[model samples]
Target chain A: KKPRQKRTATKAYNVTQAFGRRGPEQTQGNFGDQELIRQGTDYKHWPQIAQFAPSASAFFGMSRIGMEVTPSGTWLTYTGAIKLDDKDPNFKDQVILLNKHIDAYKTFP
Target chain B: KPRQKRTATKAYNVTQAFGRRGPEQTQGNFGDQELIRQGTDYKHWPQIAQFAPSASAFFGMSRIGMEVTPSGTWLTYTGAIKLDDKDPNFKDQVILLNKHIDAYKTFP
Candidate 1:
């Protein structure tokens, strides 16, 4: 199926894993926050990073840390957050969880 | 089934692998170019190190197998894409440049 797109005026949700790969920033990708669907179904995990950034370079306002995922789904929190970007390469490798009953990961203003 | 040979499996020293320009073939994040110069070496760092750190930096741009930020962060190609803004073909812009290029870098 052609990956579906669930979007808001400002926010968008990627409902598919037409995934290719990650970029460099670790902050953003040529793709979107692809963990939920693509990573969800096949659990196509990638690699983890060693250092925070390449060198003394910075995230500007970005911080690549960690996250939490549930079998049924998850609720993420980011102040002034527009979307969710999880850095886990192997967040959803379990096929059993592909059909896991997950709901909206709402954000609070 | 095999446990998938990917970043989720190995963690190598980014600094160490960054400058591994050699004559022999070793797959240990030994060098940014060496990893992605041939096979999909960047994928190993995704899980091994969380972001699968490597010695290559976009500033360095020595190798372009994977994507990175100006600050040298490993960017993930997971999220909402909008190439339709210009053309659906624009989406290929990233996969062609912004996302992984190992597949394109292969000779098989």
Candidate 2:
């Protein structure tokens, strides 16, 4: 209605999802079928966000892992990674968490 | 063969590539042909790194854009963005530079 000064901004939160994909990373076109089964917001519900990083050579062809607020609002993180050729010496897990960041409010919304 | 204490480390730098792709963003499998023609280190030649962000609905089906140093050594930045619906009121450009970060050394 555009009547109120400003509706109480939705309480913003972040969500993270990690899941397995094909050997080569998937594309954005395939995301609709994919679902957010896990997230950092709930910390309990695990949403499986899709991955689509183009630099697969360096990232061992890992899928693009990222999260964004729904309804075209904001993005928490949108980065992809290449699993080291060999398991990372430091981290046992092969998957590398590329481009990780907490979502910040642009204008409290 | 393993008697060397530590060899001199080569100086590292960052490279960036931005190019126009077809509508509906390209995928990772399509990045091989694409090339890095420009970068922050050189700031002259413009390499076209591929874009592959999966959240195209929110990002407006834009391509995934990222930069990784050659030789599989380090990554300067690897992020993608969706072009905000219509022209962003603040920025004139339709493409949003999603994951823009200056590369940082892990151990060095």
Candidate 3:
């Protein structure tokens, strides 16, 4: 008789690492879905940002890619209509959460 | 035959700050280009609150031409100025600002 192997369940919570591309196929993490958002054509492409875009869109409503004018010239920027109140008691906490995502995006790349 | 008309020239001072709007409100309402060129202190600039106020909403001042990077030229259209619930002229100014910003919402 052949021996049988046991399968273990993947834990959902406390998983800090986000999803990344493995050659041809892309996989999703337990935290969020794998909705890779691409950056605008003008600037350098950032893979980490594309991976984090799903969370940012879900939390802060940031999804669109648009052009913004400045002194030098027009460049690519993120555009979205976020509707969070500054007077809200949890506003600071929410901002801290957003910052955490931003920090991760920077470090991942 | 045509006669030449007398002409006069006007000289504006470029020595002053590039985008200084009002006397009191400096350092915050400028693009990164002007901010760097003018060398203004921005340590106390507050994070963005409510943006794109309607006729009913009240705000302190409008900060336009926001950039993603100090050296880059990505201007976010949403004005991130602080809110002043008690400012009497906030609604009036907010409306005008929206109108001004809407013109540039679509880019080249």
Candidate 4:
């Protein structure tokens, strides 16, 4: 049998803001999908913040991108899983997640 | 004689932040281009903030966009002028202005 290739998982979490406005609260560590629900609560009271939470799963799956804008400010946040194997889907996943967030923000009041 | 089109000017000033960091100070009113020099002084100490100042003219001309990234955060800013007439150089001007800022940031 041929030798099996080794694989490793990688992830990152980041937030961006426009001008000097505040940004969303987020955390990422060695956690599983269910943990995102706990993370989502951090911003539950704010509709704009909640809209951005869904990207956490996309980020966990190793592909996610998001942007937020409000009367007072705007922001973009992205996260993705990276791996060292032939089956890398980070970029495509990120694009899809990014589009989802863009659509969600379009209906904001 | 043909009726001339009346052009009205509009402008906006806004700011954004990455994570919880401070943003560069900016002001716009009825000032001319030279006033940017005064505004530049507000951020003279930070190299990254200085790189963003040139876009003010592009913003004044109605075309400019910018993005910033740090170890824990990232940000993008843009501005443009809209007019009813068909001078139509706004898009190109914004692209050029965006490229200039992008180049300056790359070296940092």
Off by over 4 Å in 1: A1-96, A104-109, B1-34, B37-77, B80-108
Which has the higher DockQ value, candidate number 2 or candidate number 3?
2
For model 2, residues A40-76, the per-residue Cα lDDT tens digits are: 2232212211222232122211223243546764332
User: Per-residue lDDT for A7 in model 1?
Assistant: 20
Which tens-of-lDDT digit does each residue in B17-90 have in candidate 2? 22221112121211111122212222211221122222222211222222344534222223334334443442
DockQ of each: 0.03, 0.09, 0.02, 0.02
Kindly list the per-residue Cα lDDT of model 1 for residues A1-109, writing each as its tens digit.
3211212111132222232233444222222233533332222332121121232111101212122234533211111101112344643332122212111122211
lDDT of 4 by residue, A23-72 (tens): 22122111112222123223222232222221211111111223334453
Better of 1 and 3 by TM-score: 3
1 or 4, greater by DockQ: 1
After aligning candidate 2 to the native by TM-score, how far in Å is the CA of A89 from where it should be?
3.4
If you superpose only chain B onto the true chain B, what TM-score does each candidate give? 0.17, 0.17, 0.25, 0.21
Higher-ranked by lDDT: 1 or 4: 1
lDDT of each: 0.24, 0.23, 0.24, 0.21
Which one is best on DockQ? 2
Kept native contacts, fraction for each prediction: 0.01, 0.04, 0.01, 0.00
Query: Clashing residue pairs in candidate 3, if any?
Result: A68-B75
- Candidate 1, residue B9: Cα displacement in angstroms equals 12
TM-scores for all candidates? 0.18, 0.24, 0.20, 0.19
TM-score of chain A of 1: 0.17
Which residue pairs does candidate 4 place in steric collision? A17-B17, A18-B15, A18-B16, A18-B17, A19-B15, A19-B16, A20-B16, A62-A81, B62-B81
